[PDB]
């Protein structure tokens, strides 16, 4: 019995199509030069092979000390939502983002994430998290997206072109439909110009459609800008109410406090180790550093823009990161025809 590993092989096919020989390209430096020259015969000489490489032994995770669960119950399960023109914004901090608690009670018709893959959410830490809440008509849900037109995306709620975060929407006909008709929810219909991203306009001034100023009287070609939705239990699906939450955050630049569910390990130093610091993953050797960070910064970057220093989120100490692959290697051979004995030079 033997066990297989991922390797690169150089296979040989004769003129009948059968594999008659092979070279394991990572057994020896000689085999590596065979693999590079793409031949089974090496002539006498000195060859550069590859820099000396060290493989990591351990893996470590370092997240901040967070105990509370995020307020999924007063964001997605609120008794009353806001109108789209006066939309609501709520800060989120100091909480574990374990969203699997939503599985057994909530069903979302729409859930789309921008700037991040949904399968990586469990391994990241999030900066400056906000939740925006409102209620719209079902047909208008397609308008909650970057670079959209329509009355919601022009007069009521606008997203930036470069947006990082997720949009979540679910049907709420049972909650927001009344047999007589629900007129609590309003929207803006007339506006001189389009809104800027993340801007809220809550004024109620008589809109002047043409000339002949209105003097706030609401006459011919002079309108009241806000209008009411009529939500009734027997509407088409297009006209039924939908509850919408937009989550906005930043990734991997500044100190973070949300940090989804993932267990932290011990800190091991002076060994090549795979590491995860606040969602930023890498490989290398960690050492004590003399750098002093100002309180508002978390990572340090060199001229090549790669991260070479990090503040520990537990002990608040600065650590330097060094690669563990370094140094040139050469192999001296008298020719494979003559012998298989070789010499190795470590430069």
């Amino acid at each position: 019995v033997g066990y297989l590993q991922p390797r690169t092989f150089l296979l040989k096919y004769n003129e009948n199509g059968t594999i008659t020989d092979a070279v394991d390209c990572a057994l020896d430096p000689l085999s590596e030069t065979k693999c590079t020259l793409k031949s089974f015969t090496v002539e006498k000489g000195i060859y550069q092979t590859s820099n000396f490489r060290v493989q990591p032994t351990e893996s470590i995770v370092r997240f901040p000390n967070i105990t509370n669960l995020c307020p999924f119950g007063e964001v997605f399960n609120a008794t009353r939502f806001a109108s789209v023109y006066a939309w609501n914004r709520k800060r989120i901090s100091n909480c574990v983002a374990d969203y699997s608690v939503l599985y057994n009670s909530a069903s979302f018709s729409t859930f789309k994430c921008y700037g991040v893959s949904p399968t990586k959410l469990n391994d990241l830490c999030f900066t400056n998290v906000y939740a925006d809440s409102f209620v719209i008509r079902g047909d208008e849900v397609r308008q909650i997206a970057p670079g959209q037109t329509g009355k919601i995306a022009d007069y009521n709620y606008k997203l930036p072109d470069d947006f990082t975060g997720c949009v979540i929407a679910w049907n709420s006909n049972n909650l927001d439909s009344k047999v007589g008709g629900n007129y609590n929810y309003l929207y803006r219909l007339f506006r001189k110009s389009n809104l800027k991203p993340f801007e809220r306009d809550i004024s109620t001034e008589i809109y002047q459609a043409g000339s002949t100023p209105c003097n706030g009287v609401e006459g011919f070609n002079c309108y009241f800008p806000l209008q009411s939705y009529g939500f009734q239990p027997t509407n088409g699906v297009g006209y039924q109410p939908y509850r919408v939450v937009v989550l906005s955050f930043e990734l991997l630049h500044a100190p973070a406090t949300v940090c989804g569910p993932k267990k932290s390990t011990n800190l091991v130093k002076n060994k090549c180790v795979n590491f995860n610091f606040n969602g930023l993953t890498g490989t290398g050797v960690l050492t004590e550093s003399n750098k002093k960070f100002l309180p508002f910064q978390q990572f340090g970057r060199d001229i090549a823009d790669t991260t070479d220093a990090v503040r520990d989120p537990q002990t608040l100490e600065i650590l330097d990161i060094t690669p563990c692959s370094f140094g040139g290697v050469s192999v001296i051979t008298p020719g494979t025809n003559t012998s298989n004995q070789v010499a190795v030079l470590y430069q």
Binding site: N51, V285, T287, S289, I303, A304, D320, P323, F326, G327
Partner: protein, 49 residues
């Protein structure tokens, strides 16, 4: 030590090589010294002399 003439000694002190010696060990630049010294920054990216 070097069996050089007087003029050769004068000439060799007027050109400053970028690096003296070809053995820079891994332990020599570990941590701060890396990415500050230009030779180690080169050598951590595969560039050898």
């Amino acid at each position: 030590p070097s069996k050089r003439s007087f003029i050769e000694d004068l000439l060799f002190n007027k050109v400053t090589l970028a690096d003296a010696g070809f053995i820079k060990q891994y332990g020599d630049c570990l941590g701060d010294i890396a990415a500050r010294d230009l030779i180690c920054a080169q050598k951590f990216n595969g560039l050898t002399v």
